[PDB]
């Protein structure tokens, strides 16, 4: 599609998991909590 920030593009920080927009990136981080989605590696590796 059309990808580019040259005109139309408001609310750069918004949630998609449940659908909740925000204002400050700091806010999105506070909401990311309930939206668990991490992938920490283990102490061993192959
Ligand atoms: Zn959400």
From Swiss-Prot:
Localization terms from the record: Nucleus
Where on this chain are zinc fingers (C2H2-type) annotated?
13-35
Q: Would you say which domain of life the source belongs to? A: Eukaryota
Q: What does this protein do?
A: May be involved in transcriptional regulation.
Say which family it is in.
Belongs to the krueppel C2H2-type zinc-finger protein family.
Q: What is this protein called?
A: Zinc finger protein 347
User: What does the organism's lineage look like at the top?
Assistant: Eukaryota, Metazoa, Chordata, Craniata, Vertebrata
């Amino acid at each position: 599609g059309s990808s580019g920030s040259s005109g139309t593009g408001e609310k750069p920080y918004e949630c998609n998991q449940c659908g909740k927009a925000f204002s400050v990136r700091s806010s999105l981080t506070t909401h990311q909590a309930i939206h668990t989605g991490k992938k920490p590696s283990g102490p061993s590796s192959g």
